[PDB]
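Re: export button greyed out
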Amino acid sequence: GPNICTTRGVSSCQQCLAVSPMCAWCSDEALPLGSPRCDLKENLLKDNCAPESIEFPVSEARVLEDRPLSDKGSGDSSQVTQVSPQRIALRLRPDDSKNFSIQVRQVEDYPVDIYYLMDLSYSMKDDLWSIQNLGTKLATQMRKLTSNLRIGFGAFVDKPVSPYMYISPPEALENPCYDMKTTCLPMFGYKHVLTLTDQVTRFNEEVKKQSVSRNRDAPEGGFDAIMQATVCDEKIGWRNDASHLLVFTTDAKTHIALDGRLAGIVQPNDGQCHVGSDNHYSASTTMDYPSLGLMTEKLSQKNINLIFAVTENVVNLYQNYSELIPGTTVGVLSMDSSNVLQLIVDAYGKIRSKVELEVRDLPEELSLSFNATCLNNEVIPGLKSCMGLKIGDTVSFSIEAKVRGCPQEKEKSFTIKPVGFKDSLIVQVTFDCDCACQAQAEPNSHRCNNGNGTFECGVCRCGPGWLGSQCECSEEDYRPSQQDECSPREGQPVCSQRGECLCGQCVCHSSDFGKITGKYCECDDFSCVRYKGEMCSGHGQCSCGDCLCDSDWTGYYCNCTTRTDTCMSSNGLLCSGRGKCECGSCVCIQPGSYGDTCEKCPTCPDACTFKKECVECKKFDRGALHDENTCNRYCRDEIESVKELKDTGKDAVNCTYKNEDDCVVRFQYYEDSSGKSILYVVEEPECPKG
Amino acid sequence: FNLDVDSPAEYSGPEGSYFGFAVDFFVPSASSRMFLLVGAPKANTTQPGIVEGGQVLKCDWSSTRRCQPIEFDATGNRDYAKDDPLEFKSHQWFGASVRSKQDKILACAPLYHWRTEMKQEREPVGTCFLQDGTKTVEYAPCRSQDIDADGQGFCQGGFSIDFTKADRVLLGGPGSFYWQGQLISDQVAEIVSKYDPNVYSIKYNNQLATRTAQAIFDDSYLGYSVAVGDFNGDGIDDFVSGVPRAARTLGMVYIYDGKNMSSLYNFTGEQMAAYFGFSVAATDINGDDYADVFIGAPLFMDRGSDGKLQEVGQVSVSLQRASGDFQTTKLNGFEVFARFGSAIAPLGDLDQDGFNDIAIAAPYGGEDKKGIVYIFNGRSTGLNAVPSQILEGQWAARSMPPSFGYSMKGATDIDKNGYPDLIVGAFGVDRAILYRARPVITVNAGLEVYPSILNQDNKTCSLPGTALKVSCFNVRFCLKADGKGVLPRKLNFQVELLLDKLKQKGAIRRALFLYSRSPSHSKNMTISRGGLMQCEELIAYLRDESEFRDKLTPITIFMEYRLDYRTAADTTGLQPILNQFTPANISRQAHILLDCGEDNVCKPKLEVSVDSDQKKIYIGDDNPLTLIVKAQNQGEGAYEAELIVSIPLQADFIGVVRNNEALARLSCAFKTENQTRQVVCDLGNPMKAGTQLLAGLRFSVHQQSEMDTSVKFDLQIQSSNLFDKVSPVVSHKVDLAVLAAVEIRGVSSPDHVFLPIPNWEHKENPETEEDVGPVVQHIYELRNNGPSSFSKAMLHLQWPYKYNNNTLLYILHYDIDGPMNCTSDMEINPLRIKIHTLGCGVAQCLKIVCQVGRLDRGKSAILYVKSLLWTETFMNKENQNHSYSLKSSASFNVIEFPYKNLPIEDITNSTLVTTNVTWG
Amino acid sequence: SDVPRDLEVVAATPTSLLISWDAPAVTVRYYRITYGETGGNSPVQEFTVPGSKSTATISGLKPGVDYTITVYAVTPRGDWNEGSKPISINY
Ligand SMILES: *[C@@H]1O[C@H](CO)[C@@H](O[C@@H]2O[C@H](CO)[C@@H](O[C@@H]3O[C@H](CO[C@@H]4O[C@H](CO)[C@@H](O[C@H]5O[C@H](CO)[C@@H](O)[C@H](O)[C@@H]5O)[C@H](O)[C@@H]4O)[C@@H](O)[C@H](O[C@H]4O[C@H](CO)[C@@H](O)[C@H](O)[C@@H]4O)[C@@H]3O)[C@H](O)[C@H]2NC(C)=O)[C@H](O)[C@H]1NC(C)=O
Ligand SMILES: *[C@@H]1O[C@H](CO)[C@@H](O[C@@H]2O[C@H](CO)[C@@H](O[C@@H]3O[C@H](CO)[C@@H](O)[C@H](O)[C@@H]3O)[C@H](O)[C@H]2NC(C)=O)[C@H](O)[C@H]1NC(C)=O
Ligand SMILES: *[C@@H]1O[C@H](CO)[C@@H](O[C@@H]2O[C@H](CO)[C@@H](O)[C@H](O)[C@H]2NC(C)=O)[C@H](O)[C@H]1NC(C)=O
Ligand SMILES: *[C@@H]1O[C@H](CO)[C@@H](O[C@@H]2O[C@H](CO)[C@@H](O)[C@H](O)[C@H]2NC(C)=O)[C@H](O)[C@H]1NC(C)=O
Ligand SMILES: *[C@@H]1O[C@H](CO)[C@@H](O[C@@H]2O[C@H](CO)[C@@H](O)[C@H](O)[C@H]2NC(C)=O)[C@H](O)[C@H]1NC(C)=O
Ligand SMILES: *[C@@H]1O[C@H](CO)[C@@H](O[C@@H]2O[C@H](CO)[C@@H](O)[C@H](O)[C@H]2NC(C)=O)[C@H](O)[C@H]1NC(C)=O
Ligand SMILES: *[C@@H]1O[C@H](CO)[C@@H](O)[C@H](O)[C@H]1NC(C)=O
Ligand SMILES: *[C@@H]1O[C@H](CO)[C@@H](O)[C@H](O)[C@H]1NC(C)=O
Ligand SMILES: *[C@@H]1O[C@H](CO)[C@@H](O)[C@H](O)[C@H]1NC(C)=O
Ligand SMILES: *[C@@H]1O[C@H](CO)[C@@H](O)[C@H](O)[C@H]1NC(C)=O
Ligand SMILES: *[C@@H]1O[C@H](CO)[C@@H](O)[C@H](O)[C@H]1NC(C)=O
Ligand SMILES: *[C@@H]1O[C@H](CO)[C@@H](O)[C@H](O)[C@H]1NC(C)=O
Ligand SMILES: *[C@@H]1O[C@H](CO)[C@@H](O)[C@H](O)[C@H]1NC(C)=O
Ligand SMILES: *[C@@H]1O[C@H](CO)[C@@H](O)[C@H](O)[C@H]1NC(C)=O
Ligand SMILES: [Mn+2]
Ligand SMILES: [Mn+2]
Ligand SMILES: [Mn+2]
Ligand SMILES: [Mn+2]
Ligand SMILES: [Mn+2]
Ligand SMILES: [Mn+2]
Ligand SMILES: [Mn+2]
Ligand SMILES: [Mn+2]
Ligand code: NA
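Workaround output, generated via the alternate export path:
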């Protein structure tokens, strides 16, 4: 019918496709002027013109390859492929969108190489001792989770220059610990000793060959070491098919970027590898410590999982450093480093417990939406991450890609990928802004005779002032009283009085303060709406009175974000499960709850009411939370049936409830510091006597 | 926006010498010549045995572009003994800090090392050389009898320096007291008068210094940067220093009193490792004569559109109020890894608009990462958040990044042009660049048309070529321009005139000039300084009757003017710049006479009518407010008709109603130019007879006062007609209303107590909290959700104290959260115990009454009642095996509102909390 | 304050002998114990004890022998800083 492509359309082949994803053009080999023009498929279809003349490109989500997700990722087969599909071809017409899917899996036995990065300042002398046999002890523990293991060692103290270094007396340079009446070795910025190897005996051998040095100022820059161990992959020997864990052990504070100004170091850190054949960091004296941003970028590019093993005094500090470096987990390190072997295994559990997609090289012209399927069939829109997973689980994501207009950019490409993973989804983008008939030239004259001219795709757009299919008028007087068909709903003013009608076409006048477009001049820019006084909030383009929002912006006013990060709580659940997330702000559903993340609910029931739902399905295998098969997703708490339930739990809760069997169950809830929380359930409850 | 990037001053020292690492102006009172001071550490000198001691070079504006090193030390290392140096001085980074006030120059070497004269050590104490005229003294306050890291040995004093309004240096050093940092202030006269070259540690009278603190402040790096300003009424410049690693590397800025060195104010960064306090600066950006604080955080990470962290850097802008704590705003960077907050340089009043300006530098951003300097203009409201100009680095990378903008100094006028200029240091390419400010001209141009209405039958003027009478009018374009500072007397302006700007390209001209016979014309005008608005004339003949068929549509006379460069100062290439925000073109419109009646003048009657679909507007939140305007013109056509909506301060106008056919769109734009906010809507040009138009405008009121009863909108129509050009002003008001949704909620923790109690016996006189029974906890929350707040409320708790003379729920304690007090009619915890349905009806009642203060939207008030189940009363004889439900109720009544002299109503409700004890 | 006080042998016993010092008034980060023989080339031996512990034990030497034991105090500032005055006793 009248629609949009029919009227308010009809300028040119390329200009008709840019109107709507649903539009089409025709070159009918004849001249029934009428209104075949630019129109929909179904409309143009019953008007005939279909010797392939209809040009209706459709957006394509075609996959170029999708290998099946593997089962065991250790050895044989080929191409472990923990992500699928891998390469798909995205082809988008102007202002259109298509959607595809991606599935990722944490695969069973997967190769794991772990690189030990250790502080060697004097307060780690106790730590270096007990680490002697922990190379082979780590072999047996990681053997359970992974058959193919690699370990390597590297050391750091601080920048070997004043003020950090002991520069005097000259009697103490080779022995920086002199007044201590003992002997250590000169300090070093970063020292790489053992490259990653599958021989765990080779680890213990290089340990205890190493010894401890001394420094002056308390902060010990290990960020030089972390940066180098990440980007020197050739030197330290990261596998490309394996899970990369970098364990960072220190008991004290750390130097941050711009601290090196005191030592006279004004050169910013470059993400390059300066560790040479001498296995020492050469730029340590000449180059500043790396910023958190530069560390984050290179840590992500090389797929390195950074673990902070730190003492209880400084553990809260590195927690907050890790909060600025997503994907990095922290753990409490004992003073003598007897806890690392267990802390490593726990850290790997966290790292493989989460899945989050990252985007590389994304063209800004198109934006990516996200829905998430993590727990059975339940979808969580707007989220590009999943939480609470165990190895072997598989999750899905649905993604939508939408453009504005369309570029001639030579189609580029971009990457979708989970963090810390080698496998990725590569999307080749393509844009067809224009019909196929444009390659047939026909430069000017043709059907529009002398006085220059033009003919394109079955129509003639001729001249500066000449208008029609037959070029005429051009304000020679030449007065058509056009009336009908120069304005709809006959009786209304001509071309809306914005612009005017000459020769039958409306050439819109009063072009200033923005441009006036449209065949009836009904469309324009700047006609859109405002939010705080700023049109479309500045987050969207204005196209004929409507806003086309920028990436990560939605809504009529384009003031609504797609960001869920400000909805994310400290426990990992967005809005604490107590509300929906809308435009970056939570809206709490559960009665009596409020806060940014709905974290505050003083009138909510006690944990005894909450955590008893877990003990039902997990222990007695019944009640609610069981039939949803979420019995172990939401319940991550360790539960152990016991006698007693003694006193000394300190921070703890004692809980009593009556199950459907009319018996009284008694359990306890207890946790250690920021660590895990455990439920102690009293075995053999109290039941009515016979 | 007035900085000249075409022909700056290029200064280049030796390569590898970090030439440009620090910059300042030198304005001695001895002469009229002004010089550039450029520090260059890592520079090889003639000092014997010294490698890369560093220099400070004196560069002149004499246009020879030459720099000369200043002699400060010129000597090698002094000796503690034979073959035992007292000082080391090699790679001391002399010139890393250079600052000059009038005739005195201070330069420092923060990497200078000391032997300590007691044991053999190399301690980076740092030293400075203060030169006035020929005399040169050494100022090294951190060099003292306090030696080791717990002392001042690693202080590196001179890391940052600054002067004060009257002869006092502010010297910071990050390494004092295990790198806690230190600020030391000394009178300049004291430094000169007390200098003894044979004394390595000089005690200065009236020395202001910070003292060592607890070891938890170690590695704070106080004295990393310094600035001076007056943040109290004393009148003396006080001390501002960045502490980038302070407070768990969040970063801090300390403000010390410039008189007795006591702490005054504090600042703290919001993000760790961002290096909050790397750069500090003090200026008055808003003109309120109170110094304002600028704090740079070059490594700060904001969130992009995707939400991922990205390092763009940010700068904290804190405006000082005469009353107290500041008003702080944040300014984020643009490019990633550009380190936006690296250097903050105040520069006088750059455009001479009356408000001081400032420059923020991102040394590693820009094209090819050469460095960018952003210029920010000040305003009456504070700093303008948008840059008015950018400066790009012109020098390539070489070994290390060019670091263009790593150091800057402004606020000094090195030429007599009357505008302050700017120095930018690079030191990566070992260069320094001087940008001269160009003078600013404010130009206003008037345009008039004699007459505004054209009659085609009124042909008067004769065409030049052939004798025929043609309908004509006159167009006068007047031009006046002036500005402050140095600029020429007569200015050359090139003005263009366009007739009928609407119809162009392929169209009818409909109007041409008499002599040139052309739709367009050009003129060369020359005006002079202030006043004396000049004018010229060419006159506008109108085309033949019915030579267009287009009447109605106004003929827009368009004037635009440029400035031919030509005239400039003797400064050899400094041309003025037009004012930043000012139109370069002005338009007037002539109308052909049509349907103006027998009087040949168009006199309309304009009318505005507004009904009220919206009735109540609730205080405390934004809400849709839509006014329907009925603008009708009964009479002859109205030229350039516009609907004028004069709004209140609370308006916040947005968009228009699209969704109705009854009211058909509109053309409306928000604008505030002269002293008034308002909304303008075009009613058509011309707005013809009849023409009853319906439309709607949407508003969101953030209200005001809380003493306000109503909000005021005044509406009228305006036009260009000579008579009856306007409409009677119509006013519509919607009343403020009070709506507060207040709920009371409660919870029992636990809601169940199962009997009997495990491991419980009976003590007849117990003080345990274990011998009484389990802990039953009732929590009541009074929350105000609705948009309106309330000032006072009452809360009544009914509690089941006893049943049949013995205790049910023994209250140990009760705690409050929020603006509330509470009182118990019975003594709580009288025994001093320390760590079917039973309500207060038909049982002994313990009442707890509470008074509630002001509760706004996001806030609530909570009462926590911790009680003990009295096991002795249950379980005994009359209660052995039965199910009892302990019930407590709480009601609330809202008695007052802050909105007095506005309708109130009332709010009241109640909820009950139950604790059920059971056997089975 | 800056120095430990009156270290004295507690348990009369063969190896796994015990010593005890007393409460430096300053805040102590760590304690460093060093021990070996008297006058030969000497096999220096050492270990570290947290500042909260006032006692230590030794594995080696003889049931009874003439030795030398020294105890260092560790300043909680910088990387590793020790006080000026360590304390020793023979046995
Ligand atoms: C802007 O931020 C700044 C950065 O934090 C703020 O500066 C800080 O202000 C704090 C508040 O005054 C101040 O804390 C006070 O420190 C002094 C230091 O004097 C001491 O003298 C003793 C012998 O030298 C030693 O202290 C003993 O006691 C401590 C426990 O406090 C033990 O740990 C020690 O071993 C020792 O036995 C110290 O060596 C130190 O030199 C204290 O005297 C003050 O004591 C006050 O509190 C106690 C109770 O806690 C009272 O009995 C006593 O009468 C005092 O009222 C404070 O602890 C920080 O030192 C100071 N930090 C810096 C770097 O300046 C600044 O206030 C803030 N301003 C604004 C406007 O926000
Ligand atoms: C983006 O801008 C639009 C328009 O400026 C905002 O629309 C307004 O949103 C509010 C809700 O946030 C709508 O609700 C109105 O507020 C009261 C508050 O209690 C609510 O109870 C009523 O339902 C009332 O309609 C409001 O109608 C709507 N339109 C307006 C004010 O004209 C939108 O919220 C903005 N989005 C973001 C994320 O900022
Ligand atoms: C994610 O799921 C949502 C579910 O709402 C999809 O939202 C679309 O938008 C409308 C507007 O509310 C929804 O009602 C429909 O469910 C969706 N429209 C359709 C399917 O035409 C959203 O498209 C989904 N995104 C992805 C990438 O799958
Ligand atoms: C200042 O002079 C010293 C002279 O020693 C220069 O230092 C030497 O530089 C060369 C070439 O860069 C090196 O091969 C030598 O090893 C350096 N000397 C030492 C002792 O290491 C220094 O480069 C000069 N600096 C400037 C800015 O000219
Ligand atoms: C008819 O045209 C004449 C000539 O343009 C008009 O006379 C002009 O009036 C304006 C003021 O309205 C003066 O600024 C011009 O200088 C006059 N021009 C002359 C006298 O040549 C006249 O106003 C027009 N209308 C009539 C006569 O009704
Ligand atoms: C709660 O009781 C206090 C103490 O009587 C009331 O007093 C307020 O606080 C100080 C005392 O610490 C008084 O000098 C102020 O005049 C009071 N301030 C305000 C804002 O009232 C307090 O008002 C009571 N609160 C309520 C809500 O009634
Ligand atoms: C889009 O919808 C789902 C994801 O929401 C996707 O699997 C499907 O293939 C797409 N369907 C269409 C019609 O584009
Ligand atoms: C870390 O950050 C949290 C809040 O994010 C804060 O409560 C805590 O004090 C911080 N700890 C340290 C050591 O900075
Ligand atoms: C929980 O109950 C047991 C059993 O009486 C008791 O020993 C323990 O102290 C209780 N724990 C707490 C935290 O009250
Ligand atoms: C320091 O600051 C001013 C003096 O300028 C005075 O008001 C204040 O009381 C002084 N305090 C101390 C402790 O000297
Ligand atoms: C004339 O000035 C306006 C603003 O006053 C500006 O938007 C426009 O670009 C200028 N030039 C024209 C209209 O040619
Ligand atoms: C207590 O018993 C009453 C009896 O009507 C019931 O309404 C209430 O929900 C019970 N409270 C509980 C089970 O917490
Ligand atoms: C409760 O105690 C009062 C105290 O005088 C007494 O008068 C009353 O009779 C008692 N009630 C019962 C039911 O024992
Ligand atoms: C009291 O609250 C109930 C819901 O809890 C509601 O239905 C009722 O209308 C409220 N009454 C008043 C007077 O606020
Ligand atoms: Mn250390
Ligand atoms: Mn240790
Ligand atoms: Mn260190
Ligand atoms: Mn002051
Ligand atoms: Mn100010
Ligand atoms: Mn200014
Ligand atoms: Mn100047
Ligand atoms: Mn009239
Ligand atoms: Na004509």
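The longest strand of chain B covers residues 884-896. The button fix ships in the next patch.
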